[PDB]
RNA sequence: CGUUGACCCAGGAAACUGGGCGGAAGUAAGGUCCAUUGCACUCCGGGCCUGAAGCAACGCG
């Protein structure tokens, strides 16, 4: 939401983009900010235009957040929040 | 779809078994047109057009 999460929630994503290449482009732009646990993207009716990237450390998520906030990606301005709830791996990876 | 195999994973002392992995399907995916600004982590909106593939080989449609 607005409380620092390992995982950022991105939206206003250009839905015209194919799935894997939407990752590929996302994973590159963001891996700069730190180790990246995974990137989830569905093009379903209600999951499209949105991506979850999960970082190892919280600080990576935080830095990725404000730095990239509101920038144009594929001709559309990203909106970034902290994700409302922790991504699954965070537990599973224990 | 069948047979004989490769490789990964789970179980098993093992033999092997299951999945990954085939005619799958007008599915995935692609173009367009509509509709959606959507908080998820076991697919998964609709129309038209186009349209695949198991990892290898052979056999069969
Ligand atoms: N998809 C398939 O069933 C492939 C069969 C084909 N005859 C082959 O040997 O590869
Ligand atoms: Cs085994
Ligand atoms: Cs198999
Ligand atoms: Cs469509
Ligand atoms: K048996
Ligand atoms: K098989
Ligand atoms: K088969
Ligand atoms: K399409
Ligand atoms: Mg064993
Ligand atoms: Mg087997
Ligand atoms: Mg077989
Ligand atoms: Mg489709
Ligand atoms: Mg259709
Ligand atoms: Mg073949």
mmCIF file of N, CA and C in Angstrom, chain A residues 7-94:
data_model
loop_
_atom_site.group_PDB
_atom_site.id
_atom_site.type_symbol
_atom_site.label_atom_id
_atom_site.label_comp_id
_atom_site.label_asym_id
_atom_site.label_seq_id
_atom_site.Cartn_x
_atom_site.Cartn_y
_atom_site.Cartn_z
ATOM 1 N N UNK A 7 8.152 -6.342 -2.104
ATOM 2 C CA UNK A 7 7.655 -6.437 -3.459
ATOM 3 C C UNK A 7 7.033 -5.117 -3.873
ATOM 4 N N UNK A 8 7.470 -4.512 -4.966
ATOM 5 C CA UNK A 8 6.733 -3.340 -5.439
ATOM 6 C C UNK A 8 5.555 -3.748 -6.335
ATOM 7 N N UNK A 9 4.524 -2.908 -6.374
ATOM 8 C CA UNK A 9 3.386 -3.132 -7.256
ATOM 9 C C UNK A 9 3.358 -2.057 -8.321
ATOM 10 N N UNK A 10 3.549 -2.458 -9.565
ATOM 11 C CA UNK A 10 3.561 -1.502 -10.647
ATOM 12 C C UNK A 10 2.302 -1.648 -11.479
ATOM 13 N N UNK A 11 1.779 -0.529 -11.960
ATOM 14 C CA UNK A 11 0.690 -0.592 -12.909
ATOM 15 C C UNK A 11 0.760 0.523 -13.915
ATOM 16 N N UNK A 12 -0.399 0.813 -14.504
ATOM 17 C CA UNK A 12 -0.504 1.621 -15.705
ATOM 18 C C UNK A 12 0.489 1.128 -16.736
ATOM 19 N N UNK A 13 0.534 -0.184 -16.892
ATOM 20 C CA UNK A 13 1.445 -0.774 -17.842
ATOM 21 C C UNK A 13 0.761 -0.952 -19.186
ATOM 22 N N UNK A 14 1.412 -0.451 -20.217
ATOM 23 C CA UNK A 14 1.006 -0.678 -21.583
ATOM 24 C C UNK A 14 0.646 -2.144 -21.882
ATOM 25 N N UNK A 15 -0.650 -2.442 -21.934
ATOM 26 C CA UNK A 15 -1.137 -3.819 -22.098
ATOM 27 C C UNK A 15 -0.785 -4.449 -23.459
ATOM 28 N N UNK A 16 -0.377 -3.606 -24.411
ATOM 29 C CA UNK A 16 -0.030 -4.034 -25.768
ATOM 30 C C UNK A 16 1.187 -4.948 -25.818
ATOM 31 N N UNK A 17 1.996 -4.908 -24.760
ATOM 32 C CA UNK A 17 3.242 -5.680 -24.683
ATOM 33 C C UNK A 17 3.077 -7.161 -24.348
ATOM 34 N N UNK A 18 3.807 -8.019 -25.058
ATOM 35 C CA UNK A 18 3.839 -9.462 -24.773
ATOM 36 C C UNK A 18 4.439 -9.787 -23.374
ATOM 37 N N UNK A 19 4.054 -10.935 -22.808
ATOM 38 C CA UNK A 19 4.343 -11.268 -21.403
ATOM 39 C C UNK A 19 5.822 -11.347 -21.057
ATOM 40 N N UNK A 20 6.539 -12.260 -21.706
ATOM 41 C CA UNK A 20 7.946 -12.498 -21.378
ATOM 42 C C UNK A 20 8.834 -11.281 -21.645
ATOM 43 N N UNK A 21 8.602 -10.617 -22.764
ATOM 44 C CA UNK A 21 9.345 -9.409 -23.069
ATOM 45 C C UNK A 21 8.975 -8.248 -22.122
ATOM 46 N N UNK A 22 7.766 -8.276 -21.554
ATOM 47 C CA UNK A 22 7.386 -7.301 -20.523
ATOM 48 C C UNK A 22 8.177 -7.555 -19.246
ATOM 49 N N UNK A 23 8.499 -8.823 -18.983
ATOM 50 C CA UNK A 23 9.390 -9.184 -17.884
ATOM 51 C C UNK A 23 10.785 -8.704 -18.212
ATOM 52 N N UNK A 24 11.315 -9.261 -19.300
ATOM 53 C CA UNK A 24 12.670 -8.989 -19.779
ATOM 54 C C UNK A 24 13.021 -7.513 -19.659
ATOM 55 N N UNK A 25 12.126 -6.652 -20.125
ATOM 56 C CA UNK A 25 12.340 -5.216 -20.043
ATOM 57 C C UNK A 25 12.221 -4.696 -18.599
ATOM 58 N N UNK A 26 11.312 -5.280 -17.832
ATOM 59 C CA UNK A 26 11.135 -4.891 -16.443
ATOM 60 C C UNK A 26 12.309 -5.348 -15.599
ATOM 61 N N UNK A 27 12.763 -6.576 -15.835
ATOM 62 C CA UNK A 27 13.811 -7.160 -14.995
ATOM 63 C C UNK A 27 15.145 -6.436 -15.145
ATOM 64 N N UNK A 28 15.408 -5.956 -16.361
ATOM 65 C CA UNK A 28 16.606 -5.179 -16.671
ATOM 66 C C UNK A 28 16.566 -3.801 -16.002
ATOM 67 N N UNK A 29 15.523 -3.025 -16.281
ATOM 68 C CA UNK A 29 15.372 -1.713 -15.657
ATOM 69 C C UNK A 29 15.515 -1.751 -14.119
ATOM 70 N N UNK A 30 14.975 -2.793 -13.500
ATOM 71 C CA UNK A 30 14.896 -2.831 -12.048
ATOM 72 C C UNK A 30 16.042 -3.556 -11.343
ATOM 73 N N UNK A 31 16.681 -4.515 -12.015
ATOM 74 C CA UNK A 31 17.768 -5.288 -11.392
ATOM 75 C C UNK A 31 18.918 -4.391 -10.965
ATOM 76 N N UNK A 32 18.952 -3.183 -11.518
ATOM 77 C CA UNK A 32 19.894 -2.157 -11.094
ATOM 78 C C UNK A 32 19.783 -1.909 -9.596
ATOM 79 N N UNK A 33 18.555 -1.894 -9.075
ATOM 80 C CA UNK A 33 18.303 -1.511 -7.682
ATOM 81 C C UNK A 33 18.597 -2.591 -6.646
ATOM 82 N N UNK A 34 18.865 -3.805 -7.114
ATOM 83 C CA UNK A 34 19.266 -4.887 -6.239
ATOM 84 C C UNK A 34 18.822 -6.235 -6.762
ATOM 85 N N UNK A 35 19.132 -7.304 -6.029
ATOM 86 C CA UNK A 35 18.778 -8.663 -6.444
ATOM 87 C C UNK A 35 17.272 -8.770 -6.571
ATOM 88 N N UNK A 36 16.815 -9.505 -7.584
ATOM 89 C CA UNK A 36 15.397 -9.585 -7.907
ATOM 90 C C UNK A 36 14.917 -11.011 -7.789
ATOM 91 N N UNK A 37 13.954 -11.234 -6.896
ATOM 92 C CA UNK A 37 13.495 -12.584 -6.553
ATOM 93 C C UNK A 37 12.637 -13.239 -7.623
ATOM 94 N N UNK A 38 11.769 -12.442 -8.229
ATOM 95 C CA UNK A 38 10.922 -12.894 -9.318
ATOM 96 C C UNK A 38 10.058 -11.752 -9.793
ATOM 97 N N UNK A 39 9.480 -11.921 -10.975
ATOM 98 C CA UNK A 39 8.599 -10.923 -11.560
ATOM 99 C C UNK A 39 7.334 -11.586 -12.095
ATOM 100 N N UNK A 40 6.203 -11.261 -11.491
ATOM 101 C CA UNK A 40 4.947 -11.841 -11.913
ATOM 102 C C UNK A 40 4.104 -10.897 -12.806
ATOM 103 N N UNK A 41 3.684 -11.420 -13.954
ATOM 104 C CA UNK A 41 2.866 -10.708 -14.920
ATOM 105 C C UNK A 41 1.851 -11.665 -15.568
ATOM 106 N N UNK A 42 0.562 -11.408 -15.364
ATOM 107 C CA UNK A 42 -0.463 -12.082 -16.154
ATOM 108 C C UNK A 42 -1.140 -11.069 -17.060
ATOM 109 N N UNK A 43 -1.656 -11.547 -18.181
ATOM 110 C CA UNK A 43 -2.345 -10.669 -19.107
ATOM 111 C C UNK A 43 -3.844 -10.939 -19.075
ATOM 112 N N UNK A 44 -4.277 -11.582 -17.991
ATOM 113 C CA UNK A 44 -5.693 -11.814 -17.747
ATOM 114 C C UNK A 44 -6.455 -10.500 -17.770
ATOM 115 N N UNK A 45 -7.776 -10.611 -17.772
ATOM 116 C CA UNK A 45 -8.644 -9.449 -17.758
ATOM 117 C C UNK A 45 -8.328 -8.496 -16.595
ATOM 118 N N UNK A 46 -8.137 -9.045 -15.399
ATOM 119 C CA UNK A 46 -7.944 -8.208 -14.226
ATOM 120 C C UNK A 46 -6.500 -8.099 -13.735
ATOM 121 N N UNK A 47 -5.588 -8.883 -14.310
ATOM 122 C CA UNK A 47 -4.182 -8.787 -13.913
ATOM 123 C C UNK A 47 -3.294 -8.038 -14.911
ATOM 124 N N UNK A 48 -3.824 -7.773 -16.097
ATOM 125 C CA UNK A 48 -3.075 -7.033 -17.105
ATOM 126 C C UNK A 48 -2.744 -5.607 -16.658
ATOM 127 N N UNK A 49 -1.788 -4.987 -17.340
ATOM 128 C CA UNK A 49 -1.393 -3.632 -17.014
ATOM 129 C C UNK A 49 -0.749 -3.506 -15.649
ATOM 130 N N UNK A 50 -0.299 -4.631 -15.106
ATOM 131 C CA UNK A 50 0.239 -4.680 -13.749
ATOM 132 C C UNK A 50 1.358 -5.719 -13.616
ATOM 133 N N UNK A 51 2.317 -5.414 -12.759
ATOM 134 C CA UNK A 51 3.461 -6.283 -12.548
ATOM 135 C C UNK A 51 3.908 -6.220 -11.098
ATOM 136 N N UNK A 52 4.414 -7.342 -10.623
ATOM 137 C CA UNK A 52 4.963 -7.433 -9.305
ATOM 138 C C UNK A 52 6.423 -7.769 -9.495
ATOM 139 N N UNK A 53 7.319 -6.909 -9.026
ATOM 140 C CA UNK A 53 8.712 -7.344 -8.892
ATOM 141 C C UNK A 53 9.115 -7.434 -7.422
ATOM 142 N N UNK A 54 9.693 -8.584 -7.072
ATOM 143 C CA UNK A 54 10.082 -8.892 -5.703
ATOM 144 C C UNK A 54 11.589 -8.772 -5.555
ATOM 145 N N UNK A 55 12.011 -7.955 -4.594
ATOM 146 C CA UNK A 55 13.420 -7.725 -4.348
ATOM 147 C C UNK A 55 13.851 -8.500 -3.103
ATOM 148 N N UNK A 56 15.145 -8.777 -2.990
ATOM 149 C CA UNK A 56 15.677 -9.479 -1.828
ATOM 150 C C UNK A 56 15.477 -8.644 -0.587
ATOM 151 N N UNK A 57 16.092 -7.467 -0.601
ATOM 152 C CA UNK A 57 16.058 -6.572 0.541
ATOM 153 C C UNK A 57 14.966 -5.511 0.341
ATOM 154 N N UNK A 58 14.406 -5.023 1.447
ATOM 155 C CA UNK A 58 13.383 -3.987 1.389
ATOM 156 C C UNK A 58 13.908 -2.702 0.750
ATOM 157 N N UNK A 59 15.067 -2.249 1.215
ATOM 158 C CA UNK A 59 15.698 -1.046 0.672
ATOM 159 C C UNK A 59 15.725 -1.018 -0.872
ATOM 160 N N UNK A 60 15.963 -2.174 -1.497
ATOM 161 C CA UNK A 60 15.931 -2.275 -2.955
ATOM 162 C C UNK A 60 14.560 -1.881 -3.501
ATOM 163 N N UNK A 61 13.513 -2.383 -2.852
ATOM 164 C CA UNK A 61 12.155 -2.041 -3.228
ATOM 165 C C UNK A 61 11.920 -0.545 -3.047
ATOM 166 N N UNK A 62 12.320 -0.025 -1.895
ATOM 167 C CA UNK A 62 12.175 1.392 -1.616
ATOM 168 C C UNK A 62 12.892 2.260 -2.661
ATOM 169 N N UNK A 63 14.158 1.957 -2.931
ATOM 170 C CA UNK A 63 14.926 2.733 -3.903
ATOM 171 C C UNK A 63 14.368 2.599 -5.314
ATOM 172 N N UNK A 64 13.945 1.387 -5.668
ATOM 173 C CA UNK A 64 13.357 1.182 -6.978
ATOM 174 C C UNK A 64 12.114 2.045 -7.080
ATOM 175 N N UNK A 65 11.417 2.190 -5.954
ATOM 176 C CA UNK A 65 10.117 2.852 -5.921
ATOM 177 C C UNK A 65 10.170 4.320 -6.351
ATOM 178 N N UNK A 66 10.812 5.155 -5.533
ATOM 179 C CA UNK A 66 10.867 6.600 -5.773
ATOM 180 C C UNK A 66 11.703 7.001 -6.999
ATOM 181 N N UNK A 67 12.737 6.218 -7.305
ATOM 182 C CA UNK A 67 13.604 6.533 -8.431
ATOM 183 C C UNK A 67 12.825 6.411 -9.715
ATOM 184 N N UNK A 68 12.095 5.308 -9.842
ATOM 185 C CA UNK A 68 11.381 4.967 -11.065
ATOM 186 C C UNK A 68 9.982 5.541 -11.108
ATOM 187 N N UNK A 69 9.504 6.009 -9.958
ATOM 188 C CA UNK A 69 8.150 6.530 -9.851
ATOM 189 C C UNK A 69 7.813 7.484 -10.978
ATOM 190 N N UNK A 70 6.705 7.202 -11.649
ATOM 191 C CA UNK A 70 6.157 8.098 -12.642
ATOM 192 C C UNK A 70 6.959 8.232 -13.916
ATOM 193 N N UNK A 71 7.911 7.344 -14.157
ATOM 194 C CA UNK A 71 8.668 7.484 -15.393
ATOM 195 C C UNK A 71 7.967 6.816 -16.571
ATOM 196 N N UNK A 72 8.197 7.319 -17.804
ATOM 197 C CA UNK A 72 7.623 6.601 -18.951
ATOM 198 C C UNK A 72 8.384 5.329 -19.350
ATOM 199 N N UNK A 73 7.605 4.252 -19.441
ATOM 200 C CA UNK A 73 8.061 2.925 -19.838
ATOM 201 C C UNK A 73 7.164 2.521 -20.989
ATOM 202 N N UNK A 74 7.774 2.244 -22.143
ATOM 203 C CA UNK A 74 7.032 1.839 -23.327
ATOM 204 C C UNK A 74 5.899 2.826 -23.682
ATOM 205 N N UNK A 75 6.169 4.110 -23.431
ATOM 206 C CA UNK A 75 5.283 5.254 -23.705
ATOM 207 C C UNK A 75 4.192 5.493 -22.685
ATOM 208 N N UNK A 76 4.265 4.773 -21.573
ATOM 209 C CA UNK A 76 3.306 4.963 -20.491
ATOM 210 C C UNK A 76 4.013 5.136 -19.151
ATOM 211 N N UNK A 77 3.509 6.077 -18.349
ATOM 212 C CA UNK A 77 4.097 6.460 -17.067
ATOM 213 C C UNK A 77 3.782 5.424 -16.009
ATOM 214 N N UNK A 78 4.791 4.747 -15.443
ATOM 215 C CA UNK A 78 4.563 3.739 -14.390
ATOM 216 C C UNK A 78 4.029 4.356 -13.103
ATOM 217 N N UNK A 79 3.154 3.626 -12.431
ATOM 218 C CA UNK A 79 2.726 3.977 -11.095
ATOM 219 C C UNK A 79 3.262 2.862 -10.218
ATOM 220 N N UNK A 80 3.997 3.233 -9.171
ATOM 221 C CA UNK A 80 4.572 2.272 -8.234
ATOM 222 C C UNK A 80 4.113 2.497 -6.791
ATOM 223 N N UNK A 81 3.684 1.416 -6.147
ATOM 224 C CA UNK A 81 3.432 1.391 -4.713
ATOM 225 C C UNK A 81 4.200 0.233 -4.170
ATOM 226 N N UNK A 82 4.248 0.173 -2.849
ATOM 227 C CA UNK A 82 4.606 -1.035 -2.150
ATOM 228 C C UNK A 82 3.409 -1.954 -2.273
ATOM 229 N N UNK A 83 3.651 -3.250 -2.404
ATOM 230 C CA UNK A 83 2.566 -4.212 -2.562
ATOM 231 C C UNK A 83 1.831 -4.381 -1.238
ATOM 232 N N UNK A 84 0.508 -4.525 -1.315
ATOM 233 C CA UNK A 84 -0.333 -4.624 -0.122
ATOM 234 C C UNK A 84 0.065 -5.771 0.806
ATOM 235 N N UNK A 85 0.268 -6.962 0.250
ATOM 236 C CA UNK A 85 0.672 -8.107 1.069
ATOM 237 C C UNK A 85 1.956 -8.740 0.534
ATOM 238 N N UNK A 86 2.726 -9.392 1.411
ATOM 239 C CA UNK A 86 4.001 -10.035 1.043
ATOM 240 C C UNK A 86 3.828 -11.081 -0.051
ATOM 241 N N UNK A 87 4.743 -11.120 -1.010
ATOM 242 C CA UNK A 87 4.679 -12.157 -2.034
ATOM 243 C C UNK A 87 4.972 -13.517 -1.413
ATOM 244 N N UNK A 88 4.484 -14.571 -2.059
ATOM 245 C CA UNK A 88 4.578 -15.925 -1.514
ATOM 246 C C UNK A 88 5.987 -16.415 -1.217
ATOM 247 N N UNK A 89 6.931 -16.191 -2.139
ATOM 248 C CA UNK A 89 8.304 -16.695 -1.986
ATOM 249 C C UNK A 89 8.911 -16.357 -0.635
ATOM 250 N N UNK A 90 8.713 -15.117 -0.198
ATOM 251 C CA UNK A 90 9.180 -14.643 1.099
ATOM 252 C C UNK A 90 9.006 -15.690 2.223
ATOM 253 N N UNK A 91 7.858 -16.356 2.254
ATOM 254 C CA UNK A 91 7.666 -17.464 3.185
ATOM 255 C C UNK A 91 8.294 -18.745 2.643
ATOM 256 N N UNK A 92 7.793 -19.197 1.493
ATOM 257 C CA UNK A 92 8.264 -20.415 0.827
ATOM 258 C C UNK A 92 9.789 -20.548 0.784
ATOM 259 N N UNK A 93 10.488 -19.453 0.487
ATOM 260 C CA UNK A 93 11.937 -19.524 0.313
ATOM 261 C C UNK A 93 12.677 -19.797 1.629
ATOM 262 N N UNK A 94 11.932 -19.958 2.719
ATOM 263 C CA UNK A 94 12.534 -20.245 4.017
ATOM 264 C C UNK A 94 13.166 -21.625 4.077
#
